[PDB]
Amino acid sequence: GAVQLRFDNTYDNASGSMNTVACSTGANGLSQRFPTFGSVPTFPHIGASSDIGGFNSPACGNCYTISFTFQGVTRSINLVAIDHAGNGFNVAQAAMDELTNGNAVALGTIDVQSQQVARSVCGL
Numbered sequence: 102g103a104v105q106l107r108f109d110n111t112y113d114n115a116s117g118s119m120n121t122v123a124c125s126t127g128a129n130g131l132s133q134r135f136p137t138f139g140s141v142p143t144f145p146h147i148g149a150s151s152d153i154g155g156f157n158s159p160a161c162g163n164c165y166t167i168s169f170t171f172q173g174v175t176r177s178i179n180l181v182a183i184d185h186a187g188n189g190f191n192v193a194q195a196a197m198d199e200l201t202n203g204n205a206v207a208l209g210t211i212d213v214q215s216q217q218v219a220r221s222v223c224g225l
Contacts (some may be wrong), residue, residue, distance in 0.1 A: 103212035103213060103214060103216075104151075104189035104190065104212070104213055105188055105189035105190070105210060105211070105212060105213075106189055106190040106191075106192060106197065106200070106210070106211050106212070106213045107126055107189075107190070107191055107192075107197075107209065107210045107211075108165065108191065108192055108193065108194040108196070108197040108206075109148070109149065109191040109192070109193070109194075109206050110194055111113075112123050112138060112145065112147050112148055112149075112191075112192060112193035112194075112196075113145060113193045113194050113195055114138065115124075115137065115138055115139025115144060115145075116137055116138070116139060117130075117138040117139075118136065118137060118138075119131050119132040119135055119136055119138070119139060119140075119183065120132050121183075122149075122183050122184035122185075123149075123153055123155050123156050123157070123158065123161070123183075123185040124153065124156075124158070124161035124162065124183045124184060125183075126156075126184075126198075127156060128156035128157060129157045129159055129161045129162075130156075130157065130161060131161055131162055131183055134162075134214045134225075135183075136140075136154035138183075138209065139209070140180075140225070141181050141183065141223075142223060142224030143164075143173075143179055143180060143181050143223045143224065144193075145176075145193040145195040145196050146178050146179060146180040146192075146193070146194060146196045146199070146223075147180065147181050147182075147183055147192070147193055147196070148180060148181075148182060148183070148186070148190050148191050148192030148196065149182065149183070149184035149185055149186035149190065149191040150163065150165070150182035150185075150186050150189070150190050150191075150194075150217060151185070151186045151187060151188055151189055152182060153182055153183075153184060153185045153186070154185060155185050158185070160182065161182070161183065162181060162182070162183070162220060162225050163181070163182045163217055163220070164179060164180070164181055164182075164217065164218050164219065164220050164221075164222050165179070165180050165181075165182065165190075165215050165216065165217050165225060166178070166179050166180075166215070166216045166217075166218050166222070167179075167180055167190070167200065167214070167215050168213060168214040168215075168216075169200045169201060169211060169213045169214070171201050171202060171204065172202065174202070176199070176200055176201070176202065177200075178196060178199055178200055179218065179222055179223050180182045180192065180196060180223070181219065181223045181225065189213075190213070190215070194206070200213070
């Protein structure tokens with residue numbers, strides 16, 4: 102079924118610290134692996150997901166193939182989830198723009214298809 106997707110400019114900034122998100126420290130935290138947002142291998146395909154409950158979630162680092170059909174073209178990206186969202190995905194604007202052929206701001210919130218894939222697809 103579809104999940105909601107919106108953008109959050111927090112993730113657009115490469116120099117942001119992994120210590121600022123839910124997937125910071127602890128057994129499942131990403132801060133040792135990827136100290137900054139820009140270091141995640143799929144950047145700027147990064148964001149928050151409701152799959153991540155909060156700190157130390159085992160869903161930290163999950164890799165998702167996210168698909169959206171707009172103006173008769175289906176577009177897909179692979180994205181790493183690094184933070185908690187209340188409802189579906191909150192992603193870097195740049196990622197939403199890629200998903201939507203540059204319509205992220207114009208759309209604001211969309212329904213996407215999401216499929217988790219292996220961590221390795223995203224370089225994790």
